[PDB]
Structure 1
Amino acid sequence: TNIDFRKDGKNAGIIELAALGFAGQPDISQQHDHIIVTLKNHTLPTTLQRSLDVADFKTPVQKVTLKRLNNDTQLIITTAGNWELVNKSAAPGYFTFQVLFTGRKISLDFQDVEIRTILQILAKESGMNIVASDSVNGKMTLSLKDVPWDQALDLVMQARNLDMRQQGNIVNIAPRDELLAKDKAFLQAEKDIADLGALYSQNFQLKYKNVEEFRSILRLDNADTTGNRNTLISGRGSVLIDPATNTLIVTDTRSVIEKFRKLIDELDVPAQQV
């Protein structure tokens, strides 16, 4: 005896089970939570009750789980949302289970669409002119109702999406985001500790000197990439923002933020000696 999983048709979760020594048919119990399959006189060994790991397979089947019963063989096929069960017997012994910040109010329903497209759609909605960087993120799914596009935008940003900066006529949205850049970086890092790390945001007060004066230097260090002149910069999502009350906010990796802070404070100190 043994269990197996596979996808077919259109996002369908098939569960091919191997029944050696069976004649009739088991008891199929389609539940709202999982599935149940008992096989009288089919007691399988604990060395064959292995479970599946089909997680995030984009299927109605959460995960297959095999468990040996007293004298029979019980099967647990966790599912999700609305679905339908379909048993198929290609032969006497082989069993299968086909598991198949102020704007107009809008309802935002985007199913598995690129954020970039959602960005465009909103703009088309007469919601500003939004222009992203190039490779901001990926695709996301949100469904909202009765929400102004501006509000939905903020909610959208939080989901996994980007942060927004507005030039005024045109708005640039960038991947300057805590979670994605670092999350991926964490996985990339071999060390477990590295798995814990963070891009963080910090506010730098500038007492002595004007914030704008810093811009030239900050832009330069920020560009740890080639770029003649970019306010937004590479180094994988580091950003410096200038608030009105002459403070600088930096969002990025800790290393990059550290560098920026050192320079800012450093310049500020000589301004300080008055």
Structure 2
Amino acid sequence: YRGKRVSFEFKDIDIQNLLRVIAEISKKNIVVADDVSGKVTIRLRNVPWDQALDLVLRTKALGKEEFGNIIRIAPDLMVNLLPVNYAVAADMAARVKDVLSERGSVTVDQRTNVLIVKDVRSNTERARSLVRSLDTQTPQV
């Protein structure tokens, strides 16, 4: 769960293809089962892959299990990184969980106090507006 930064753009492609593509980029050797799912659409910018993966899982796709050398996977939206300069990322977690409800979309907290969201643009926009708005009362030190 650490990698080079990437931008994932997938317009109506088999998750098996996204997976292989992700193995061809040295993001492990990835192998599915045979019939995992189908086709998905995502479009990410500035996301390390191992995250764009966790995030792909939550879209439609699978869960991942690693043997070590190989990993087995079994059965636009966008991603944007939000810097949080002023507040701690965990203090947002209550409010951010409360927008999601039983929706799709997710939020991931990286160690360097940045939030990452996959979702539809409309749920991304909401999550950014709240994260920045709560960050903004934190900049007045």
With normalisation by structure 1, the TM-score equals 0.29
Question: How far off its partner does 1:176 sit?
Answer: 1.9
The unaligned stretches of length 5 or more in structure 1 are: 1-100, 102-138, 166-172, 178-197, 226-234
Q: Tell me if 1:176 matches 2:54.
A: no
Question: How far off its partner does 1:239 sit?
Answer: 0.9
Q: Give the match for residue 82 of structure 2.
A: 204
Q: 1:251 aligns with which of 94, 109, 118?
A: 118
Distance 1:214 1:151, change over 3 A: same
Q: Give the match for residue 238 of structure 1.
A: 105
Matched letter for residue 99 of structure 2: D
Question: How far off its partner does 1:262 sit?
Answer: 0.5
Distance 1:238 1:201 in 2: 10
Distance 1:255 1:141, change over 3 A: closer
Matched letter for residue 259 of structure 1: R
Distance 1:140 1:266, change over 3 A: closer
Q: 1:218 aligns with which of 86, 96, 119?
A: 96
Distance 1:272 1:140 in 2: 41
Matched letter for residue 125 of structure 2: E
Distance 1:239 1:273 in 2: 29
**In terms of Rg, which structure is larger?**
1
Distance 1:273 1:149, change over 3 A: closer
Higher RCO (CA 8 Å, separation ≥ 6 residues)? 2
Question: How far off its partner does 1:140 sit?
Answer: 6.9
Distance 1:141 1:241, change over 3 A: closer
Percentage identity across paired residues of the two chains = 23
Matched letter for residue 105 of structure 2: S
1:116-140 per-residue CA deviation (whole Å, 9 max, x = no partner) reads: xxxxxxxxxxxxxxxxxxxxxxx97
Check the 8 A contact 1:163/1:176 in 2, yes or no.
no
Q: 2:54 aligns with which of 145, 150, 164?
A: 164
Question: How far off its partner does 1:160 sit?
Answer: 4.2
Between Structure 1 and Structure 2, the one with more helix by share is 2
Check the 8 A contact 1:222/1:238 in 2, yes or no.
yes
Aligned length: 94
Question: How far off its partner does 1:174 sit?
Answer: 3.1
Distance 1:260 1:213 in 2: 14
The unaligned stretches of length 5 or more in structure 2 are: 2-13, 41-51, 61-75
Q: Give the match for residue 152 of structure 1.
A: 30
1:121-179 per-residue CA deviation (whole Å, 9 max, x = no partner) reads: xxxxxxxxxxxxxxxxxx9767x8xx89942159xx9x8479337xxxxxxx73326xx
With normalisation by structure 2, the TM-score equals 0.54
Matched letter for residue 240 of structure 1: T
Distance 1:160 1:218, change over 3 A: same
The 3-state SS of whatever aligns with 1:242 is strand
Distance 1:218 1:256 in 2: 11
Question: How far off its partner does 1:200 sit?
Answer: 0.7
Query: What is the aligned-residue RMSD (CA, Å)?
Result: 3.7
Runs (4 or more) in structure 1 with deviation over 4 Å come to: 139-142, 147-150, 159-162
